[PDB]
Amino acid sequence: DLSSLRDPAGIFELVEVVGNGTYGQVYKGRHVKTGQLAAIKVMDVTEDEEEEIKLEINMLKKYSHHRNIATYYGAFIKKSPPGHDDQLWLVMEFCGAGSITDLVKNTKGNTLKEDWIAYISREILRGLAHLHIHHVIHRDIKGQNVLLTENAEVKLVDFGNTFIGTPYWMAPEVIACDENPDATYDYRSDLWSCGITAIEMAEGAPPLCDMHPMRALFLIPRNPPPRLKSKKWSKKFFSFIEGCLVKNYMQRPSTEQLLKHPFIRDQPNERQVRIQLKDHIDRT
Numbered sequence: 001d002l003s004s005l006r007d008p009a010g011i012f013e014l015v016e017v018v019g020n021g022t023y024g025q026v027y028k029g030r031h032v033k034t035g036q037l038a039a040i041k042v043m044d045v046t047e048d049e050e051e052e053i054k055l056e057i058n059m060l061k062k063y064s065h066h067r068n069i070a071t072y073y074g075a076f077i078k079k080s081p082p083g084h085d086d087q088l089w090l091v092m093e094f095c096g097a098g099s100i101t102d103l104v105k106n107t108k109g110n111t112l113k114e115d116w117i118a119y120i121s122r123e124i125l126r127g128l129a130h131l132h133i134h135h136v137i138h139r140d141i142k143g144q145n146v147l148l149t150e151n152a153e154v155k156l157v158d159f160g161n162t163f164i165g166t167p168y169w170m171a172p173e174v175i176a177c178d179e180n181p182d183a184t185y186d187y188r189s190d191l192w193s194c195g196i197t198a199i200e201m202a203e204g205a206p207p208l209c210d211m212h213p214m215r216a217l218f219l220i221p222r223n224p225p226p227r228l229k230s231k232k233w234s235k236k237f238f239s240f241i242e243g244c245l246v247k248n249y250m251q252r253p254s255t256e257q258l259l260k261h262p263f264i265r266d267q268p269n270e271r272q273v274r275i276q277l278k279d280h281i282d283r284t
């Protein structure tokens with residue numbers, strides 16, 4: 001029932017595009033009556049697209065209520081004249097402290113402390129576990145899709161169409177080749193992506209960042225599992241990276257297994273890390 005969706009006129013205001021265009025037509029929005037912020041995903045909707053759109057709303061209503069997923073608020077339809085085309089606004093939680101990509105880029109030497117990596121990675125894994133239990137694959141885990149609220153809460157965004165995006169966080173099994181002709185996403189594909197995101201937090205960029213995207217896409221299923229460049233890291237972090245980045249997804253551990261891994265499981269400085277992150281956020 002899309003006919004019941006209200007016009008957003010004096011309920012939500014569009015401020016500006018959020019980020020720069022990583023998310024596309026996603027806006028910084030304001031609740032008119034309170035001044036509260038929201039992230040507004042905007043899309044042109046045709047008569048045939050109506051059925052596919054209904055399933056998106058339902059997914060957000062059921063799965064976004066976990067603390068490691070940005071909350072869904074509601075939907076609006078800005079009806080255009082009979083000469084088409086209507087706009088659909090999906091209003092979600094605004095994560096003011098921005099992405100994990102921004103967090104590494106704003107940090108001296110473009111590297112995060114190991115205890116920060118463990119905390120963020122665990123929160124990613126906790127969000128993935130909620131999705132996987134409900135038979136949902138995120139399909140796009142990367143630093144830009146992991147956001148921080150003003151209270152250092154870690155939240156996942158943009159889970160699941162004519163364009164292929166960035167290849168750098170893609171698991172080998174999602175890239176079709178002669179051996180793997182029918183490339184398909186598995187729940188374990190999100191675990192590889194989590195591992196690449198952990199390397200991104202550690203080095204400021206994913207593994208084949210210096211390659212043309214088409215060359216990286218060719219190299220991912222052919223190259224051995226990527227490794228951390230520095231030897232400074234603990235034996236537990238190298239082990240976590242090794243766990244995430246098992247080449248063949250069939251021997252790759254589950255989200256439940258990775259949540260029990262010593263690097264994720266053993267976090268005594270958890271309380272201090274949350275304060276440390278909150279302090280970095282306070283410095284706008």
Ligand SMILES: NC(=O)c1ccc(-c2ncc(-c3ccc(Cl)cc3)o2)cc1
Pocket residue numbers: 018019023026039041070092093094095096097098099102147157158
């Ligand atoms: N200023 C910033 O860097 C910044 C960047 C991003 C955000 C943000 N909050 C929620 C979302 C979101 C993104 C994609 C989707 Cl699909 C849904 C929600 O993005 C806030 C601030």
